Amino acid sequence: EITCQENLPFTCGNTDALNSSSFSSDFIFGVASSAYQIEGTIGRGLNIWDGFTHRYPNKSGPDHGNGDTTCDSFSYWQKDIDVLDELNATGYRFSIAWSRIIPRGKRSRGVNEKGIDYYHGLISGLIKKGITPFVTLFHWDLPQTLQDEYEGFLDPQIIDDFKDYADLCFEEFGDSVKYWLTINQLYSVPTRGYGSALDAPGRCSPTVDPSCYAGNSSTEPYIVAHHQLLAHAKVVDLYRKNYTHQGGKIGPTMITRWFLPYNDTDRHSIAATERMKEFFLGWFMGPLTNGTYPQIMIDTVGERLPSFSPEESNLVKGSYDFLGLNYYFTQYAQPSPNPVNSTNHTAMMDAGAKLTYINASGHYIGPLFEKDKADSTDNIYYYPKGIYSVMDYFKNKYYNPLIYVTENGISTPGDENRNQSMLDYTRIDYLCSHLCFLNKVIKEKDVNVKGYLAWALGDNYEFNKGFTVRFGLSYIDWNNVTDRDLKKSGQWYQTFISP
Amino acid sequence: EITCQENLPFTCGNTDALNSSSFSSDFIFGVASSAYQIEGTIGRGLNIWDGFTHRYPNKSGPDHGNGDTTCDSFSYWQKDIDVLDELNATGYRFSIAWSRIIPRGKRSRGVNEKGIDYYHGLISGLIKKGITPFVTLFHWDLPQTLQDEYEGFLDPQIIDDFKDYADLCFEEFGDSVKYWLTINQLYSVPTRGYGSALDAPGRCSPTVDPSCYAGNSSTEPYIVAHHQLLAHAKVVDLYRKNYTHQGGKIGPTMITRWFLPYNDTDRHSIAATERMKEFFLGWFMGPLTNGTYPQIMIDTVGERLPSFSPEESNLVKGSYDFLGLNYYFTQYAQPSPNPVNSTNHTAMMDAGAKLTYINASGHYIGPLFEKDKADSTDNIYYYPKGIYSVMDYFKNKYYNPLIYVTENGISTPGDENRNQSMLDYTRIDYLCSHLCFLNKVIKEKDVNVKGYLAWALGDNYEFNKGFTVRFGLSYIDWNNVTDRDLKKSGQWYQTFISP
Ligand SMILES: *[C@@H]1O[C@H](CO)[C@@H](O[C@@H]2O[C@H](CO)[C@@H](O)[C@H](O)[C@H]2NC(C)=O)[C@H](O)[C@H]1NC(C)=O
Ligand SMILES: *[C@@H]1O[C@H](CO)[C@@H](O[C@@H]2O[C@H](CO)[C@@H](O)[C@H](O)[C@H]2NC(C)=O)[C@H](O)[C@H]1NC(C)=O
Ligand SMILES: *[C@@H]1O[C@H](CO)[C@@H](O)[C@H](O)[C@H]1NC(C)=O
Ligand SMILES: *[C@@H]1O[C@H](CO)[C@@H](O)[C@H](O)[C@H]1NC(C)=O
Ligand SMILES: *[C@@H]1O[C@H](CO)[C@@H](O)[C@H](O)[C@H]1NC(C)=O
Ligand SMILES: *[C@@H]1O[C@H](CO)[C@@H](O)[C@H](O)[C@H]1NC(C)=O
Ligand SMILES: *[C@@H]1O[C@H](CO)[C@@H](O)[C@H](O)[C@H]1NC(C)=O
Ligand SMILES: *[C@@H]1O[C@H](CO)[C@@H](O)[C@H](O)[C@H]1NC(C)=O
Ligand SMILES: [Zn+2]
């Protein structure tokens, strides 16, 4: 019988008690990255994260940081491989920058051979060290040209441009890459990119944020989400019809959270909690498992919710071999009004829920996850049991899928000096406590989880935060980015992997 | 009788001997800037100078600098006005960033109202201080979307997108702006952007520079130059047909140089010198004055030189009310082979000339202009008489045009400390020696020159050089960009203007 801790102090950093041998022999352990966050702009065209961070520097991070140079994995990809080799990792998730291989967006405009060569060399280097690549086609970095031609995922033109990009990736890299992710965190671009305008491309209703160049936060999230699902599904169909000889697997990436009632004896909070599951997870998992959006979304969102045709429904339903599930934290849910006629209405209001990290009796859900220095009542707290609850829910609700945990990690402040930054015991605690619950759910609930990739390989540009936080298991000096030095967490993870 | 110095030491920094009163009462004196170089990316979309500097950081400058934040004239435009007011300047040349007012490139995709407001406030502030705006529509910063959709000026689609952009500018700003420049330095994008790939977008033949993503240095410069002329001419026709009520004037910007024979008794060097005038100046001025390219270009370039239809010829011929002439330096010319079958052939080779700053007897043409620390035999030297020779030539060869000198200036090294940087006596010498010759040519040759704008108002991002050189008449601290402090040159220029 497995017992796992939910509160500080944690004792799962002892590899005598928790290590890779606790999991099945074939289980993959590694780390993750994304292209905007690590590569730099050298050698690629411009994408909407370049555009957004440059047009709206205060939205890029408090330091106005961006991905222009970052950790320079364009130059230092071998050093990334070296970290993975030091870890004895068996997996690495990275993304392909669309703008590096097709700078002009549309494949018929030509490819960048040198960009293709960059990923060939990375892939070959990984495989030579026994590391399985997990490759994200689209980690938010849409070529700027496509956003300017037709507003990107706002328009159905995205589907064929994404398909042709993906086809090039399968053609060039699929002989070696056997695990593909289509779109990173399906929920995020619709809501943050087109709802709150916290993320690229930065569209919203005028009264939500007067700096947005255009948008409608009530309608566009739904349009974009719908196009994401269709573009994803078209790529999965292309993969499974035209690249079956490659013997690989493909799936989407979800951001997952668990949700608990703010007041577990209040029917209204219980209802809000179940609505959140539907609106947060079901928005995408309903289509992916059934070809339809959840009924509560149909009912609430009404004419703002697009319909799938019968052909589209069939294309989207079942459009995965596995799910990449990202998991960071859990929220309490309580009811909230949905003012659909307000000029500041957002899609996110349609769930009719307010989310907190403290429940009605004043209980904080778990240890600190992210401090918010401008408003401490907005601090985020984590909840290790949430990974158990999410995986159990996916198994039970969503037809026992094959799952890889494609991100899980925690930040430390960029204000810490290097010695403090390397002494990242809070990261060991977060990672181990989640791994304990992941082992527990696999054993107790028989969830088909076959790997775990911690966020992040190394310090990088963090969307929305610049270089003001660090997520890496290895440390990068922003004054001299060449080295990636394993932190205490990376050293712990090395021991966990090879105990 | 006016006597002007050609060699150090110069004594024209004495405003007792040379000042604004030496020129006609109406003559405009000011300074110049461009949008990529000064504004920053905040509040605008991405353009090909963002793309180029980010994809090819070693081509942005030795420091890998770029226009992301620069002097932040987005925030500090009032401080630019303040410099101009301190100078008692009567003119200011600035550019509109296309990506700030139409981030999606094509006008039908929507405009950025806040971008429009930015230029309205600048323009209104200038006029309130008695400063005449000279506004460049296109200072190289093409929206990235257009380059990615159709490769920008490589394709005739540029013409209508440029026209619709210009129409928006005339509509929004032409009630106040009475001097418009279409395209900055017509020669530069074809040759550097599409020939040598030193400049955005960075296209060339594969053996010219293997880093180029695509291109053909032998053909594309000509295509791009042809489209520039057509796009320019379509905008001038639009202006003069639809905006005549505004009572303003429009013209192109030329980069001018003079050319002297490397050996003034050698017929081959004399011939190369005359070819250079045709290939450098006539490439554009032939079309602008006659609707045809120079015969030597027709003959040499052959099938690589596009033809104008009779309608196009008529549109381009006479498509200016004035010329903005930029002038920095003069070169000696000697013959050079034109290897049209070589895989590394460039359009620039078609002139059949090699350019130097030292003549056959070892004479350097004038004082140092720009030191090249990697190769000192590649140092640039200036030649004050060249402004006289250029203006005389334009009057005689090109039908006595109205001229404004739209740039003239010199750099100092970014390695200098602030006190050295503010003690910019080399800049006084360059500016005064050229102003002396400009007065001389107006008086002696009756060239219709009606203003002079020195490059640059303040230190900025220099194309190709990052922040490794400074051109400003006012100093900017890159650690805190708010202030623009007049250098010795700016203080001199203040006295020259109001002696
Ligand atoms: C807030 O969360 C706390 C902690 O989960 C809940 O308190 C638990 O309540 C259960 C059922 O009453 C008790 O058996 C436990 O002993 C309590 N745990 C502790 C740490 O107090 C609490 O019920 C939640 N409040 C609401 C209103 O939902
Ligand atoms: C190189 O440039 C120098 C300077 O312009 C030329 O020298 C001048 O030559 C003229 C005509 O012979 C003489 O009257 C001057 O006195 C010379 N000036 C000085 C400073 O020497 C020289 O002829 C040029 N060489 C060539 C080969 O063209
Ligand atoms: C940040 O930038 C936007 C312009 O993009 C401006 O609207 C907003 O006021 C600025 N935010 C703060 C908090 O200053
Ligand atoms: C607009 O929304 C903000 C945040 O969503 C809220 O605090 C404010 O009350 C809203 N105003 C109206 C008019 O509803
Ligand atoms: C930068 O870091 C690398 C790796 O430690 C080191 O070899 C190189 O000398 C350092 N550069 C400077 C300028 O210190
Ligand atoms: C600069 O960058 C390009 C890649 O864009 C590379 O081809 C070239 O070798 C580098 N130049 C030098 C001098 O290192
Ligand atoms: C290619 O050109 C470079 C510079 O243009 C020159 O130095 C070299 O000799 C040329 N090679 C051939 C094959 O002509
Ligand atoms: C930056 O420069 C401005 C103008 O001199 C000054 O007022 C401001 O205090 C300076 N900022 C810092 C942080 O020194
Ligand atoms: Zn940047």
Q: Domain map of chain B by residue range?
A: 1-499
CA separation for the pair B184, B188 (Å, rounded): 8
Instruction: Sort residue A336 into left (φ over 0), alpha (ψ -120 to 50) or beta.
Output: beta
Question: Under a CB-based contact definition with an 8 Å cutoff, are residues B429 and B4 in contact?
Answer: no
Smallest Cβ distance to A42: which of B56, B112, B143?
A: B56
Question: Under a CB-based contact definition with an 8 Å cutoff, are residues B83 and B486 in contact?
Answer: yes
Other beta carbons within 10 angstroms of residue B24's beta carbon come to 12
Is the N-terminal amide bond of B221 cis, ω within 30° of 0? no
Please give the single-letter amino acid code of residue B134.
F
CA separation for the pair A14, A12 (Å, rounded): 5
Query: Could you give the 3-state DSSP secondary structure of residue A187?
Result: coil
Question: Under a CB-based contact definition with an 8 Å cutoff, are residues B60 and B464 in contact?
Answer: yes
CA distance B41 to chain A (A): 4
Experimental technique, in short, is X-ray
Of all atoms in ligand 7, which is nearest to the CA of residue B339?
Answer: 14
Angle at alpha carbon of residue B92, lines to B87 and B96, rounded to 5° = 145
Q: Which of these, B436, B392, B419, lies nearest to B475 by C-alpha position?
A: B419
CA distance A148 to chain B (A): 4
Query: Could you give the 3-state DSSP secondary structure of residue A44?
Result: coil
Query: Could you give the 3-state DSSP secondary structure of residue A267?
Result: helix
CA separation for the pair B286, B297 (Å, rounded): 10
Which ligand approaches the C-alpha of residue B60 most closely? 6
What would the two tokens of residue B85 be? 């007011």
B496: Cβ–Cβ under 8 A, 6 or more apart, which residues? Answer: B15, B18, B19, B20, B29, B432, B435
H or E element in which residue A484 lies: strand A480-486
Contacts of A116 in chain B (CB under 8 A): none
CA separation for the pair A209, B108 (Å, rounded): 23
H or E element in which residue B455 lies: strand B448-455
CA separation for the pair B344, B349 (Å, rounded): 10
Q: What is the Å distance from ligand 8's center to B67 Cα?
A: 21
Catalytically annotated residue among B39, B151, B172, B407: B407
Please give the single-letter amino acid code of residue A480.
N
Q: Which of these, B349, B322, B202, lies nearest to B254 by C-alpha position?
A: B322
Q: Would the CB atoms of B51 and A68 count as touching at under 8 Å?
A: no
Q: Running DSSP on this structure, what letter comes out for residue B481?
A: E
User: Which pairing describes strands A412-413 and A469-470: parallel, antiparallel, or unpaired?
Assistant: antiparallel
Q: Which of these, A34, A43, A8, A48, lies nearest to A152 by C-alpha position?
A: A48
Query: What angle, rounded to 10 degrees, do the helices at A157-173 and A220-242 form?
Result: 40
Beta strands (DSSP E) in A307-455 are 323-335, 353-356, 368-370, 380-381, 402-407, 412-413, 448-455
Nearest CA to ligand 5 atom 12: A480
Q: What is the Å distance from ligand 8's center to B419 Cα?
A: 18
- Enter the resolution in angstroms: 2.0
A309: Cβ–Cβ under 8 A, 6 or more apart, which residues? Answer: none
B407 catalytic? Reply is yes
Q: Catalogue the active-site residues of A.
A: 407
What would the two tokens of residue A358 be? 């403290």
Q: Which of these, A297, A180, A164, A299, lies nearest to A234 by C-alpha position?
A: A164
Other beta carbons within 10 angstroms of residue B200's beta carbon come to 29
Question: Under a CB-based contact definition with an 8 Å cutoff, are residues B338 and B350 in contact?
Answer: yes
Is the N-terminal amide bond of A337 cis, ω within 30° of 0? no
A495: Cβ–Cβ under 8 A, 6 or more apart, which residues? Answer: A15, A19
* CATH for the stretch B1-499: 3.20.20.80
Other beta carbons within 10 angstroms of residue A479's beta carbon come to 5
In chain A the first and final C-alpha atoms are separated, in Å, by 21
Is the N-terminal amide bond of B353 cis, ω within 30° of 0? no
H or E element in which residue A147 lies: helix A144-150
Is the N-terminal amide bond of A367 cis, ω within 30° of 0? no
Backbone angles phi, psi at B364, to 5 degrees: -80, 140
Q: Exposure of A3 by Cβ count < 10 A (0-12 exposed, 13-18 middle, 19+ buried)? A: exposed
What would the two tokens of residue A224 be? 């974009």
CA separation for the pair A104, B219 (Å, rounded): 21
Angle at alpha carbon of residue A157, lines to A152 and A163, rounded to 5° = 95
Side-chain half-sphere CA neighbours of B251 within 13 A: 23
How far is it between the farthest Cα atoms of chain B? 60
What would the two tokens of residue A228 be? 């994401």
Cα dihedral A103, A105, A106, A110 in deg (nearest 10): 0
CA separation for the pair A349, A337 (Å, rounded): 7
How far is it between the farthest Cα atoms of chain A? 60
Question: Under a CB-based contact definition with an 8 Å cutoff, are residues A239 and A315 in contact?
Answer: no
Backbone angles phi, psi at A118, to 5 degrees: -60, -50
Please give the single-letter amino acid code of residue B7.
N
CA separation for the pair B319, B223 (Å, rounded): 19
CA separation for the pair B134, A179 (Å, rounded): 57
Angle at alpha carbon of residue A360, lines to A358 and A366, rounded to 5° = 25
H or E element in which residue B124 lies: helix B113-128
Would the CB of B263 count as within 6 Å of ligand 2? yes
CA separation for the pair A157, A153 (Å, rounded): 8
Question: Under a CB-based contact definition with an 8 Å cutoff, are residues B69 and A53 in contact?
Answer: no
Contacts of B151 in chain A (CB under 8 A): 104, 109
Query: Could you give the 3-state DSSP secondary structure of residue B5?
Result: coil
Side-chain half-sphere CA neighbours of A58 within 13 A: 5
Residues of A with CB under 8 A from a CB of B: 40-46, 50-51, 53-58, 64, 66, 68-69, 103-106, 109-110, 112, 114, 143-149, 151, 211, 213-214
Q: Would the CB atoms of A42 and B55 count as touching at under 8 Å?
A: yes
> Which of B117, B148, B212, B481 to mutate against chain A (most A CBs within 10 Å)?
B148
Please give the single-letter amino acid code of residue A247.
G
CA separation for the pair A121, A116 (Å, rounded): 9
Question: Under a CB-based contact definition with an 8 Å cutoff, are residues B141 and B97 in contact?
Answer: yes
Q: Exposure of A420 by Cβ count < 10 A (0-12 exposed, 13-18 middle, 19+ buried)? A: exposed
Query: Could you give the 3-state DSSP secondary structure of residue B366?
Result: coil
What would the two tokens of residue A176 be? 């070696």
What would the two tokens of residue B366 be? 């004038």
Backbone angles phi, psi at B62, to 5 degrees: -65, -25
Query: Could you give the 3-state DSSP secondary structure of residue A213?
Result: coil
CA separation for the pair A455, A468 (Å, rounded): 16
In chain B the first and final C-alpha atoms are separated, in Å, by 21
- Residue for token pair 């005389």: B392
Query: What angle, rounded to 10 degrees, do the helices at B73-87 and B113-128 form?
Result: 10
Q: Running DSSP on this structure, what letter comes out for residue B434?
A: H
Query: What angle, rounded to 10 degrees, do the helices at B157-173 and B220-242 form?
Result: 40
CA separation for the pair B457, B272 (Å, rounded): 36
Question: Under a CB-based contact definition with an 8 Å cutoff, are residues A346 and A218 in contact?
Answer: yes
CA separation for the pair B104, A156 (Å, rounded): 17
Other beta carbons within 10 angstroms of residue B482's beta carbon come to 11
Report how far Cα A133 is from the mean position of its chain's Cα atoms: 16
CA distance B361 to chain A (A): 44
Q: Which of these, B382, B494, B496, lies nearest to B435 by C-alpha position?
A: B496
What sections of A349-424 are H helices per DSSP? 385-397, 418-422
**b/e per residue A191-206 (b: at least 16 CB within 10 A):** bbbbbbbbbbbbbbbe
CA distance B404 to chain A (A): 33
Report how far Cα B256 is from the mean position of its chain's Cα atoms: 9
Contacts of A106 in chain B (CB under 8 A): 148-149
Q: Running DSSP on this structure, what letter comes out for residue B308?
A: P
Question: Under a CB-based contact definition with an 8 Å cutoff, are residues B66 and B466 in contact?
Answer: yes
Report how far Cα A344 is from the mean position of its chain's Cα atoms: 27
Q: Would the CB atoms of A104 and B45 count as touching at under 8 Å?
A: no
What would the two tokens of residue A247 be? 């013997």
Q: Which of these, B139, B134, B122, lies nearest to B49 by C-alpha position?
A: B139
Query: What angle, rounded to 10 degrees, do the helices at A48-55 and B48-55 form?
Result: 110
Instruction: Sort residue A466 into left (φ over 0), alpha (ψ -120 to 50) or beta.
Output: left
CA separation for the pair A224, A155 (Å, rounded): 8
What would the two tokens of residue A210 be? 């007067």
Q: Exposure of A271 by Cβ count < 10 A (0-12 exposed, 13-18 middle, 19+ buried)? A: middle
What would the two tokens of residue A213 be? 């160049």
Side-chain half-sphere CA neighbours of A331 within 13 A: 20
Q: Can you give the three-state secondary structure of B237-279, one letter per residue?
A: HHHHHHCHHHCCEEECEEEEEEEEECCCCCHHHHHHHHHHHHH
Please give the single-letter amino acid code of residue A15.
T
CA separation for the pair B333, B353 (Å, rounded): 6
Query: Could you give the 3-state DSSP secondary structure of residue A408?
Result: coil
Other beta carbons within 10 angstroms of residue A430's beta carbon come to 26
- Residue for token pair 């030292």: B358
Q: Which of these, B131, B133, B162, lies nearest to B146 by C-alpha position?
A: B162
CA separation for the pair B33, A162 (Å, rounded): 40
Question: Under a CB-based contact definition with an 8 Å cutoff, are residues B283 and B351 in contact?
Answer: no
Q: Which of these, A499, A497, A493, lies nearest to A427 by C-alpha position?
A: A493
B308: Cβ–Cβ under 8 A, 6 or more apart, which residues? Answer: B226, B287, B291, B292, B316
CA separation for the pair B128, B122 (Å, rounded): 10
- Residue for token pair 């507003």: A151
What would the two tokens of residue A27 be? 């289980």
Beta strands (DSSP E) in A45-186 are 91-95, 132-138, 179-183
CA separation for the pair B273, B332 (Å, rounded): 7
Q: In DSSP terms, which residues pair with B90 in a beta bridge?
A: none
Question: Under a CB-based contact definition with an 8 Å cutoff, are residues A123 and A115 in contact?
Answer: no
**For chain A, counts of helices (H) and of strands (E):** 19, 16
CA separation for the pair A435, A20 (Å, rounded): 10
Residues of B with CB under 8 A from a CB of A: 40-46, 50-51, 53-58, 64, 66, 68-69, 103-106, 109-110, 112, 114, 143-149, 151, 211, 213-214
Length of chain B: 499
H or E element in which residue A425 lies: helix A425-445
Positive or negative, the CA dihedral B119, B125, B128, B132 is negative
What would the two tokens of residue A343 be? 């000029």
Question: Under a CB-based contact definition with an 8 Å cutoff, are residues B451 and B29 in contact?
Answer: yes
Query: Could you give the 3-state DSSP secondary structure of residue B173?
Result: helix
Would the CB of B480 count as within 6 Å of ligand 8? yes
Interface size between A and B, measured as CB pairs under 8 A: 129
Backbone angles phi, psi at A184, to 5 degrees: -70, 135
CA separation for the pair B440, B2 (Å, rounded): 6
Taking the CA atoms of chain A, what radius of gyration do you get in angstroms?
21
Report how far Cα B126 is from the mean position of its chain's Cα atoms: 22
Q: In DSSP terms, which residues pair with A404 in a beta bridge?
A: A324
Question: Under a CB-based contact definition with an 8 Å cutoff, are residues B70 and B37 in contact?
Answer: yes
